[PDB]
Design a protein around this ligand. Sequence first.
Ligand SMILES: Nc1ncnc2c1ncn2[C@@H]1O[C@H](COP(=O)(O)OP(=O)(O)OP(=O)(O)O)[C@@H](O)[C@H]1O
Lengths: 79, 228, 308, 143, 148
Amino acid sequence: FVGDNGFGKSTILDAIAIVLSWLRSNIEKESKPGTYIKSHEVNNSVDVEYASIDANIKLKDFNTSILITKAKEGAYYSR
Amino acid sequence: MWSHPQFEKINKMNLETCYVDFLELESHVINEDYLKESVELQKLISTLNESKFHLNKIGIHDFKRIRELQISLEDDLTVFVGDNGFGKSTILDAIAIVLSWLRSNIEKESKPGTYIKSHEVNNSVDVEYASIDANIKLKDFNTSILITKAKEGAYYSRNNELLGVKKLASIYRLVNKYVDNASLPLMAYYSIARSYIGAKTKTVWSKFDVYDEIEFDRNDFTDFFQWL
Amino acid sequence: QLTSKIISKFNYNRLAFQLLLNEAPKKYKVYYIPKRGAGFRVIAQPTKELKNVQRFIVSLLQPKLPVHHKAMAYEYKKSIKDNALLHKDNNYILKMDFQNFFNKIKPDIFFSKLENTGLKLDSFDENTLRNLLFWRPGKKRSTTLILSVGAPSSPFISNFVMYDFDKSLDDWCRNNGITYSRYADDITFSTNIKDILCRVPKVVKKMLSLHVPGLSINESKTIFTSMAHNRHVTGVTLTPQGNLSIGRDRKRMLFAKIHKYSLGLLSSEEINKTKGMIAFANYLEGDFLLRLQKKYGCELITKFLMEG
Amino acid sequence: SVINTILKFLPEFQWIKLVYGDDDYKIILKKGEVELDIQQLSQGEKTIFTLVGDLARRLILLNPNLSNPLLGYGIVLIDEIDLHLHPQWQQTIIERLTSTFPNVQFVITTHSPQVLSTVSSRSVRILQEVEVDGVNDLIVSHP
Amino acid sequence: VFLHNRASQEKLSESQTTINALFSDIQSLKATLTQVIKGLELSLKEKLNYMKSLQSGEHKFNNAVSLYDSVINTILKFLPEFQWIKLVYGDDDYKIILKKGEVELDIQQLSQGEKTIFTLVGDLARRLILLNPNLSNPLLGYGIVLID
RNA sequence: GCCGGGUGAUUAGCCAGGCUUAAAUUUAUUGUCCGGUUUAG
Ligand SMILES: Nc1ncnc2c1ncn2[C@@H]1O[C@H](COP(=O)(O)OP(=O)(O)OP(=O)(O)O)[C@@H](O)[C@H]1O
């Protein structure tokens, strides 16, 4: 990844780090919790309600997908 | 907390009917300007604003010392008088317990509140469970709630009734969605632990920080200083 | 012998009946129905092939199981009006109801009660009965059976089950001058004596624990009322004079509907809508049609009645 | 408004100020003719300071649109209102609490007869112990 | 707890050669040590201290049971409502049981009113019984107490 | 005394306009396509 900008290329790596943590937890024990998205990481714009991250893992021809989402406080709908 | 085809029934001006009418209307229109300027929203807001929060009555069965008892509370001021060991605190913790589920359901729906501890049920031989019931009246709208726990060692189940609180909380969240600076009710509890009173440089303040806990203890004093 | 009669009537071979016996507790459909207000309700209903063998079983078992005479639900020649006629001349009224009444009835208590009546049945009869009248929610390893509602055989079983409770509570309430009556999972008491209705909540709880284990009282639906406020019993209002009534709001509902009909401004759907309500009100009161004729005239009412 | 609200319950003080020190902030009072610090107050004044300050902060935070935020709705529960308070302050705490926040429901438990001398008869419930039918139980009686 | 164990072992006997048994236990501890080290040494010293019961050997008029009864009746003097107080052993632990009316209560279930009195009186009599090990009635020493 | 309930009559009529009557602090109307009750083709 190449370029300079205010958002910072580091944050993308953080997103991947969150996803892999869930995979590790389930290996240690069944249905063990992973790492959640804290409320202060959601965007502060007035037209947002929730944040999400989508990832996919390929193993030969075996495909898996994971979605992680969190909604702001006081939202009408939960995710 | 869902939609309906608005069964006609008979003419009425209940808050629930306005809530259902708005829910039915919003399922068709897509433009937000029309929704934000519709007359149904104005009716819902005016009805919610003029209504006054007021807890109506409470009943206790088999909880701590009290065996069976019902109270009615005035809308402005009530005082309990008694000696030591007469369950003056028990009523206050019962009310805090029932109010915690309403506090929880406003932050995010389907979120649990406070349960009954296993050592609160009565110590007599013939008891099997304990329960608490309450009722909240918004002028002409009535809700009720029951919380119960079975004694350890028994093999018969009991559940809770949480339709009323979930329905009431959905109205508050829906109004909060379409209004910039909508208000919220105030719930507080000043226990006997005010004696204990004697940072990361927070920069953002909102109305949802006071909903972290119903009781007052420790760091609230610290935050008061930072706020001042 | 019950399996033989079912086989003879429906012409079932050994293999087909064995398969039906094995797969019976899973032929149910779960769906939602809207609520008057806001919310939803959940129902479960069996298939067509199981319903008409449940009705046959009920018709076979009806003349052999006693039922108390104070239960006015799902009974022949009984209705709401006969329920309300008991409390029509008393002052103070108290109402209570249970908590998840239907799904607290299990085959253990059904067979326990059935053994006490003196009716002896073989192992085959017990096996066929257990696998035919009960529902199994959850996975195939649940091994839990409940009655549910929406099945033609549940109401009779529940009425037969609550016989002892009805009998024991009846003679306790009679000795203290209190009237008592039960409709499905609703119980009502009424009397004229002051400060006597504050003692029954502990009595009913003791009776429930003694005579039918498992059941319990929903404590958030207990009501006390007198002649100074609104009084009604299962949907019919009691005027202070002591007469049954439908309510002033519905009377003006119908008077306005008919007046708007006289101008020919009513859709065809509302005619069939209002005709049933008018018939029900006439049955409940007994003089609604006379008042309508005395106000709008027989020619218009007769034309409206014969319409459609 | 916050400062005067706090000063409403402590008539013996003159003003409250916030003074920036070299490395820290300080709250300075003035009692009589001597300036005081928040750590040099008695237990009673500390209790009143914390109670009123917390109530005002909660009300202001919850009602931003109102011109006067002290008129919100809600319910407040207090246990043993007469902690660390002399009888002179015991007689007037109730009417000041009710006058400052007029649209808030209050539930209060007390222990002493001094407060009972200044409450209407329609808002008093008295607990008692009575053995009925061989079982001891608690009852509530209106005056 | 310690005063109760001493009361049971000393006055109510049921201990036989307690000193010899404690010495044998210390000998077994030494044999195990020959066969965490600091903890084992501390336990061995504790066993020797227990074996020193014969060295102490007082069993005087102010025995353990007399002190236990004096403490219990002293506490019960300030709480007229209650009936009796006991120390119950169960689930490999000790707990305090109080009787009020017809219901037995633990210590967690009391109100603040009797919690304050029980704590203050218990600590005051603890210090009086502990700092005057020679008086016939230990609640007769001298001192100064400040209460706010 | 006051307030809150019951309702025959009244009105291009589900609002309103009148006359009666009731009282311990003390109801805020409910689930269909199943079951039984009412009417009808
Ligand atoms: N499980 C229980 N079974 C029976 N009685 C209990 C139980 N738990 C508590 N109690 C009773 O509760 C009483 C104290 O209750 P509570 O603390 O509500 O009263 P209070 O002294 O008026 O309160 P406070 O001083 O905390 O304001 C004790 O005297 C005890 O007998």
